[PDB]
């Protein structure tokens, strides 16, 4: 009967899905951050 509990619902393995989701969110935020201009002339380096 143990197997059905894991196989049926989708919230059983949240405690490990959360970790990888957090890491993905952090990486995505860091990558997307450089698109910000930070109050400078332009985000792209060469145009300055």
């Amino acid at each position: 009967k143990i197997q059905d509990s894991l196989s049926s619902t989708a919230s059983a393995l949240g405690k490990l899905q959360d970790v990888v989701n957090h890491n993905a969110q952090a990486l995505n935020t860091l990558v997307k951050q450089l698109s910000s201009k930070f109050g400078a002339i332009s985000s792209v380096l060469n145009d300055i």
Binding site: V31, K32, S35, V44, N46, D47
Partner: protein, 49 residues
């Protein structure tokens, strides 16, 4: 350097599909990755080194 696209990187053939009015290329990281040569119609993919 394409009409105002300064940069570097290894350029290869771009087999991806562009709409007739579309020339730039952007990614999830939100940086230029593909272009279309104005002289010759083929599409170029600017892959990194």
């Amino acid at each position: 350097n394409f009409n105002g696209l300064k940069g570097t990187g290894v350029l290869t053939e771009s087999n991806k599909k562009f709409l007739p009015f579309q020339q730039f290329g952007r990614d999830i990281a939100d940086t230029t990755d593909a272009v279309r040569d104005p002289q010759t119609l083929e599409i170029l993919d600017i892959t990194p080194c």
